[PDB]
Design a protein around this motif. Structure first.
Motif, PDB file in Angstrom:
ATOM      1  N   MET A 101       0.807  -1.213   0.000  1.00  0.00           N
ATOM      2  CA  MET A 101       0.000   0.000   0.000  1.00  0.00           C
ATOM      3  C   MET A 101       0.844   1.268   0.000  1.00  0.00           C
ATOM      4  O   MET A 101       0.420   2.294   0.544  1.00  0.00           O
ATOM      5  N   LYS A 103       2.907   1.513  -3.120  1.00  0.00           N
ATOM      6  CA  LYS A 103       3.152   1.595  -4.552  1.00  0.00           C
ATOM      7  C   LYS A 103       2.000   2.269  -5.281  1.00  0.00           C
ATOM      8  O   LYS A 103       2.219   2.915  -6.311  1.00  0.00           O
ATOM      9  N   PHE A 104       0.778   2.138  -4.769  1.00  0.00           N
ATOM     10  CA  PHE A 104      -0.396   2.679  -5.438  1.00  0.00           C
ATOM     11  C   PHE A 104      -1.349   3.425  -4.523  1.00  0.00           C
ATOM     12  O   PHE A 104      -2.230   4.126  -5.032  1.00  0.00           O
ATOM     13  N   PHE A 105      -1.212   3.303  -3.210  1.00  0.00           N
ATOM     14  CA  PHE A 105      -2.257   3.707  -2.283  1.00  0.00           C
ATOM     15  C   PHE A 105      -1.971   5.107  -1.757  1.00  0.00           C
ATOM     16  O   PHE A 105      -0.989   5.318  -1.038  1.00  0.00           O
TER      17      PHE A 105
END
Lengths: 120, 129, 52, 458, 197, 343, 153, 61
Positions: A101, A103-105
């Motif tokens: 969470m 890398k994209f969150f």
């Protein structure tokens, strides 16, 4: 200044974390080794002692097996399930909270909690 | 749709509730459980909110229901609320005065049970000597 | 013995029933030195036992 | 003679001994808050009204008798029972009053808990022109339900002053609402404990539903402990109707809220402990081994096994009572952790691209995703490829040295172009290309996005 | 009393060194022959054990520093007690650094033949594993303590205002550079070291 | 900051949480807009005071009951922080309460000269300065029979080192001398305790917060001695503390300060106290400088001086709420904004 | 190759593996038991859920006991310096790790059981912090059980 | 809770006694393992019967 400093921090953080998380996923090997070795050295201390071809059918040699199975089973349930799998659970949890969470969150939001009488 | 991959689609609607149907619409929205309100009057203080004289009332009555919950552990339309808050208050008053006429009487009981013992334990001291 | 007995003498002047408890804790504190005595007597018994 | 609290007996003794220098015989007898009696014997005069200023200061109640110790006891027992009967009257009245209240407090409490909740919400409205304006969020599926329930309700009660229901196009951040059933609720609460996601971001509790029990099972690998955990989870899944209408304390509320995270954590633990040979730390001789032991050997000597084939499913059972079996398990589980962490990271990194594509921001794509992708894949994607390619080659039939992959990635950054143990043809010139592709994205990810946001303000 | 022993050991070292030096025997205090004749397995096993020990005594140090203040700061603001656990995580990763370096070092730990036992390479790979265990355990110690301090400040600035945790997480990032740099240096030091042969 | 959170980890983070309940300037402006004490109660109920006047119910609510309960919850929060303290921290918490014990001694032995009843001169006493023999100061009149009977077992016993009892029992003139001299010896002892055993980040910012107490007490003794005192400077110099920023050169000139200008020209040579005696309310100058010294004691993190800086700021908060509730109950609003807010 | 002083390091490793681990477990039991006794005088119904830090400190001492038992079954009169120093490393690893983990569990546990009585949402917080401090003893146990497997090879 | 431990004592010890009876190499196959298979199976199967007695007795509780 609020974009350049943020992108410098993002670059330092991302290039740090690409190295820092592929070495932090080695806890999947660490806790697996710990679980396998503890389950080995508990067997070897509890029921490897109860296995003997002498006094076959004796009451002492069968109460030995009963007591050592009870001591093995309560130690497996108390340590190797409840107080080891909880640690494995929490480590697979932090592998999601940090290593996955990030890398994209983004995570800058607020929950939908409506005006409801079923929640008072 | 389902919303397990991304969030659901929110709209920010705007109602206009008249004063004739106000409690009924609010109790309807409380049962529908679909409308997430937003505080429009953030600049107003804790007072001067419009419904503060009706909220300090049910803060006081919440305190009184808490007192009734402590005494037991120690041992709707507007009129239908207005006549049941009356039997909350009328019973809280008698329960408070009967509890305060009981603990202050237990203290007076112990003030005599402590005075009996200091006579029993000081006649004995003279009978020994 | 010292840091129990000072508190026990401070306490047994207020409460007379604390004196037996003081003696019993001091017995548990003095049996430590008795255990050291037992270990050293059993050790000293083997000092010159068949030693060449 | 009087009463005193027991915690003040020693300080009253010391104050009276410092006031009367000696000159006293002080006793105490415990009355059986805890209290205590005292006798002083103030031998003399002129301090008798000063001892009483010590006693009455620290709340001691002197009991002067001066008549008899048998005449006041009768007049005092004629008050103890006379007041105990008033206790037995008023406490009977108290327990009579509590009967109509103890069976009624869940109505009086639940009225106020929602009435205060009504007025707290009515404080959040506008009160502009003798009518409240309620602005707030509702999901788009429930718009027609509001427009069909509010319209029928204001007409069925009379009171001909209709409400106005508008839909405002705004730009502040909406709430997030993930529609979870009983299977995905525990994963959603687990993933929302850390951070509430922003509006229409990719849910992180929808890849959690498999990966969290599976990353658990990689650490918790045993068919015996895994079957125990699966069984004590399936006990809660099959009995979820009797346990739902029940008061749960915090630990068992935690355990029953996640009765489906533990069922998957047991079901994957059985699978991975069948991949290992680990059934209460024992092996399973299910398939045919890839290693045979020599038939004729002396007792007590160290022997090796000859490779016949490869074990079909999972790790091999001829590594159990083995001296160097733990070295092989270290190599396997370390490279397993590296490849699964690589897979998890490169799977969760594509969700960032899907987010920036849904936001329709090519500036964020070219500034963060692509320089991140060809930095991650050019180093640790190459490491995860090199592990698989070393597993693919034989290195003994070829009579080539097996390369070390730790000091391959050490020497890829320190001494480029120098390959001591060659791992593939064209290694020394492809690692320079991968090193330059990784080093070019340290200024590019740092300098693309600010310098093209600055250019779009001119 | 500890200063008295520090002075007494210093006086005994000076008197012994000057007595050994004045009598023409000053080369008998021979640290090089001490390094040549002690067993390389001492230095190797001591480096591995101090690597995994001193990484953990820094990780556990930082864990209580930013754990006790997280729990104290979470009494009034309990909405930090899960988000701010990344400050426990950043000071916990310095133990997995020392663990995965200690196992890689213990892979280089075999039985050397007695005829080539105090050789060039066997003694080199004792020295290298010793100091590369020290420079990883001490670096992860200091990194764990620094990340614990900068997480204990973050756990209270989070409970003050919610927008401060993002700003002070950056200090934890710059503090957690250090354990990764020790991770790099301890792998470069024992990179050319072979097994015991 | 490396050994702080062993015994003081939970203690600081709760006190740092107690700091966030300090009312800001907007939360004071929202209190100055009130019209009734009931509206001020409901405005305080949205802060971290919430429902502390719940057992009052709008009828017996006076401006002194607010000062009673708002300070009572300060005292209970201080007792909760003190109960979790151990070692040097618990001793530091005790040394704070010694200065309130001195004020309760000097308030208890003036209620016996005037023959006021002992049950009503103790409700005016301070709850943090409670020792077990505090009601028994109503037993004697002279200083020697109140020391040698009561005040030997108290922790105020080393502070009776210069109080010379010449067998004159007590008027109101020498009880203030005994009060100032006990507070002088206490400021000496607590400065030596801070310098000795308190660690270094909580040492330098606590020596300033305590030297300010000494300087304020020196200026108040040297300025209240003009009107209601005719004493010699050799006997006046035993009342001025010698730990502060003001001692070695300026308390000498405050000792022989016979006039107001003897104080003003003495405080013109010190750099941070000049201009206090020129314009404005002097008590507001000292309270403002106290809050500016307590504000930058929260900015150092791993320090036990945050307890002192919290409780003095929370006492100033209770004083500001008391001043506002005194303004909105007596209908005087010309100086309602005379509160002090640095938070 | 196998000197006369070689089982000193194995015997002292077997000693230190239980000594340092029991010191850490004793700190984790005592300091977190003070918090249990201080908390449960005003709210005594939290007594058996606050018992988790002393249980985790006991698990630490069990981890040290395992290494001490497994080292003392490989001791001999004529073992090499390889076996001796590898038993020493297996003792030092779990010793320092159990000592650190017990100190961390002790300092986190009393603060956690004090914050749990004021805020009920801090029980999950203190458990999730103490699980990170528990596995540090596992992180030394891994190196101890790996150095045990290389004892006689 | 004795019935759960007793049911596992039936199942696990019955499987262990069967693996000693059939001379399975994960239990007999080493030098440190016991030599005679059915001699160990005869004293593990009786323990399985003892835990079955505990399971039947605590199954009527």
């Amino acid at each position: 200044g609020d974009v350049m400093i943020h992108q410098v921090i993002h670059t330092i953080e991302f290039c740090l974390n690409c190295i820092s998380h592929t070495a932090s996923y080695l806890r999947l090997w660490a806790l697996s080794l710990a679980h396998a070795q503890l389950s080995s050295v508990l067997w070897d201390m509890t029921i490897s002692n109860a296995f003997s071809s002498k006094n076959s059918g004796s009451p002492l040699a069968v109460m030995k097996v009963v007591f050592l199975f009870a001591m093995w089973f309560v130690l497996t349930v108390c340590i190797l399930v409840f107080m080891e799998g909880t640690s494995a659970m929490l480590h697979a949890l932090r592998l999601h909270w940090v290593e996955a969470m990030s890398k994209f969150f983004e995570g800058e939001g607020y929950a939908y909690e409506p005006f409801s009488f079923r929640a008072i | 749709e389902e919303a397990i991959f991304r969030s659901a689609d929110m709209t920010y609607v705007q109602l206009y509730i008249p004063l004739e149907v106000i409690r009924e619409v609010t109790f309807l929205l409380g049962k529908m459980s679909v409308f997430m309100v937003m505080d429009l009057n953030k600049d107003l203080t804790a007072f001067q909110r419009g419904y503060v004289n009706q909220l300090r009332r049910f803060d006081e009555v919440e305190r009184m229901v808490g007192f009734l919950n402590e005494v037991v552990e120690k041992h709707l339309s507007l009129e239908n609320v207005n006549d049941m808050v009356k039997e909350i208050t009328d019973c809280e008053s008698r329960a408070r005065q009967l509890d305060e006429s009981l603990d202050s009487l237990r203290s007076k009981l112990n003030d005599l049970l402590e005075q009996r013992q200091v006579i029993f334990e000081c006649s004995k001291f003279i009978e020994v000597n | 013995i010292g840091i129990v007995g000072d508190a026990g003498v401070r306490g047994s002047s207020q409460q007379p029933r604390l004196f037996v408890g003081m003696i019993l804790i001091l017995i548990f504190a003095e049996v430590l030195g008795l255990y050291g005595l037992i270990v050293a007597l059993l050790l000293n018994s083997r000092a010159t036992q068949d030693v060449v | 003679t009087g009463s005193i609290r027991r915690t003040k007996v020693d300080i009253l003794n010391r104050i009276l001994w410092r006031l009367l220098r000696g000159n006293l015989i002080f006793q105490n007898f415990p009355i059986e808050v805890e209290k205590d009696c005292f006798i002083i014997f103030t031998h003399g005069e002129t301090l008798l009204k000063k001892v009483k200023r010590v006693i009455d200061s620290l709340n001691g109640k002197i009991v002067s008798l001066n008549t008899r110790s048998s005449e006041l006891v009768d007049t005092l027992n004629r008050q103890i029972d006379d007041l105990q009967r008033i206790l037995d009257t008023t406490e009977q009245t108290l327990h009579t009053e509590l009967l109509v209240i103890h069976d009624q407090l869940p109505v009086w409490s639940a009225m106020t808990k929602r009435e205060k909740y009504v007025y707290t919400t009515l404080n959040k409205f506008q009160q502009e022109s003798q009518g409240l304006i309620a602005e707030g969020w509702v999901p788009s599926t429930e718009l027609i339900h509001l427009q069909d329930s509010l319209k029928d309700y204001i007409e069925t009660l009379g009171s001909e002053y209709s409400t106005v229901f508008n839909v405002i196009l705004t730009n502040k951040l909406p709430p997030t609402y993930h529609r979870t059933n009983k299977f995905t609720q525990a994963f959603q609460s687990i993933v929302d404990a850390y951070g509430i996601a922003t509006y229409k971001e990719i849910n992180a509790g929808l890849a959690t539903v498999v990966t969290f029990p599976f990353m658990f099972a990689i650490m918790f690998g045993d068919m015996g402990h895994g079957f125990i955990l699966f069984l004590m989870a399936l006990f809660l899944v099959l009995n979820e109707r009797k346990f739902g209408a029940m008061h749960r304390d915090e630990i068992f509320d935690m355990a029953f809220t996640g009765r489906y995270v533990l069922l998957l954590m047991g079901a994957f633990s059985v699978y991975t402990g069948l991949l290992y040979n680990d059934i209460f730390s024992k092996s399973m001789t299910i398939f045919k081994s890839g290693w045979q032991w020599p038939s004729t050997f002396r007792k007590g000597e160290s022997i090796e096994a000859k490779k016949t084939g490869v074990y079909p499913f999972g790790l091999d059972f001829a590594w159990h009572g083995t001296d160097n079996g733990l070295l092989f398990s270290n190599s396997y589980k370390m490279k397993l952790s590296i490849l699964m962490g690589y897979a998890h990271m490169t799977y969760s990194f594509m969700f960032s691209y899907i987010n920036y594509r849904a936001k329709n921001s090519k500036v964020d794509i070219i500034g963060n995703f692509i320089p991140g992708l060809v930095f991650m894949q050019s180093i640790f994607g190459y490491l995860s490829w090199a592990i698989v390619y070393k597993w693919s080659k034989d290195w003994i039939k070829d009579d080539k040295p097996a390369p070390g992959l730790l000091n391959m990635l050490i020497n890829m950054f320190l001494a480029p172009g120098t390959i001591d143990d060659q791992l593939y043809s064209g290694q020394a010139k492809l690692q320079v290309v991968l090193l330059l592709a990784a080093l070019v994205c340290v200024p590019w990810l740092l300098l693309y996005k600010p310098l093209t946001l600055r250019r779009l303000n001119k | 009393f500890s200063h008295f022993l520090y002075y007494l050991v210093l006086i005994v070292v000076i008197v012994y060194g000057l007595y050994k030096l004045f009598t023409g025997h000053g080369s008998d205090i021979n640290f090089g022959k001490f390094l040549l004749r002690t067993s390389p397995y001492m230095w190797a096993n001591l480096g591995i054990a101090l690597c995994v020990g001193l990484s953990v005594v820094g990780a556990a140090w930082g864990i209580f520093i930013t754990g006790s203040s997280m729990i104290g700061a979470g009494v009034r603001a309990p909405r930090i007690t899960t988000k701010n656990l990344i400050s426990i995580i950043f000071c916990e990763v310095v133990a997995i650094y020392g663990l995965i370096i200690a196992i890689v070092f213990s892979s280089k730990l075999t039985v050397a033949t007695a005829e080539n036992m105090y050789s060039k390479s066997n003694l080199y790979t004792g020295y290298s594993l010793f100091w590369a265990g020290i420079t990883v355990g001490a670096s992860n110690l200091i990194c764990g303590i620094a990340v614990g301090i900068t997480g204990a400040t973050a756990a209270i600035s989070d409970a003050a205002d919610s927008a401060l945790f993002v700003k002070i997480l950056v200090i934890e990032i710059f503090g957690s550079i250090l354990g990764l740099l020790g991770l790099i240096v301890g792998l470069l030091m024992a990179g050319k070291a072979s097994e015991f042969q | 900051g490396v050994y702080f959170n062993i015994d003081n980890g939970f203690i600081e983070g709760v006190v740092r949480g107690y700091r966030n309940g300090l009312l800001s300037n907007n939360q004071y402006i929202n209190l100055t807009q009130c019209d009734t004490l009931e509206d001020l109660k409901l405005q305080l109920s949205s802060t971290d005071y919430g429902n502390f006047l719940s057992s009052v119910s709008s009828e017996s609510l006076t401006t002194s009951l607010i000062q009673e309960y708002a300070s009572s919850k300060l005292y209970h929060e201080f007792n909760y922080i003190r109960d979790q303290s151990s070692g040097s921290t618990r001793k530091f918490m005790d040394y704070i309460t010694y200065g309130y014990m001195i004020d309760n001694v000097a308030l208890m032995i003036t209620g016996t000269i005037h023959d006021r009843d002992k049950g009503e001169i103790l409700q005016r006493c301070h709850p943090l300065g409670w020792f077990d023999t505090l009601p028994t100061l109503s037993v004697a009149t002279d200083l020697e029979s109140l020391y040698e009977t009561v005040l030997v077992d108290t922790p105020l016993a080393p502070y009776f080192k210069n109080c010379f009892d010449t067998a004159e029992e007590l008027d109101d003139m020498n009880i203030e001398i005994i009060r100032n001299k006990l507070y002088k010896a206490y400021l000496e002892d607590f400065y030596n305790f801070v310098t000795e055993e308190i660690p270094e980040p909580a040492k330098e910012c606590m020596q300033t917060l305590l030297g300010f107490e000494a300087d304020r007490r020196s200026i108040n003794i040297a300025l209240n001695s003009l009107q209601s005192s005719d004493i010699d400077p050799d006997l006046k110099s035993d009342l001025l503390p010698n730990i502060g920023k003001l001692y070695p050169l300026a308390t000498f000139h405050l000792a022989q300060a016979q006039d107001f200008e003897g104080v003003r020209a003495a405080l013109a040579n010190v750099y941070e106290y000049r201009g206090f005696l020129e314009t404005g309310n002097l008590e507001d100058h000292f309270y403002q400088l106290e809050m500016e010294l307590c504000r930058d004691a929260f900015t150092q993190q791993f320090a036990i001086s945050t307890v002192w800086a919290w409780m003095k700021s929370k006492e100033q908060e209770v004083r500001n709420i008391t001043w506002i509730a005194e303004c909105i109950a007596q209908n005087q609003r010309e100086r309602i904004n005379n509160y002090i807010s640095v938070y | 190759l196998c000197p006369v002083y070689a089982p000193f390091f194995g015997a002292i490793g077997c000693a230190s593996a239980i000594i340092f681990t029991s010191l850490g477990a004793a700190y984790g039991t005592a300091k977190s038991g003070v918090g249990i006794c201080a908390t449960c005088v005003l709210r005594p119904d939290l007594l058996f859920k606050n018992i988790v830090p002393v249980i985790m400190a006991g698990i630490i001492a069990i981890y040290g006991l395992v290494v001490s038992v497994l080292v003392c079954y490989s001791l001999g009169q004529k073992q090499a310096l390889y076996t001796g120093f590898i038993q020493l490393g297996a003792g030092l690893s779990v010793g320092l790790s159990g000592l650190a983990a017990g100190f961390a569990i002790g300092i986190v546990g009393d603060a956690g059981v004090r914050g749990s009585s004021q805020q009920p949402r801090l029980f999950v917080g203190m458990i999730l912090i103490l699980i990170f401090a528990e596995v540090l003893g596992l992180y030394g146990l891994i190196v101890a059980l790996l150095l045990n497997s290389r004892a006689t090879q | 809770c004795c019935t759960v431990l007793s049911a596992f004592g039936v199942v696990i010890l019955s499987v262990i006694a069967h693996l000693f009876n059939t001379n399975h190499e994960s239990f007999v196959g080493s030098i440190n393992d016991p030599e005679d298979g059915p001699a160990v199976a005869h004293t593990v199967y009786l323990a399985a019967l003892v835990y079955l007695v505990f399971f039947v007795f605590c199954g009527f509780q």
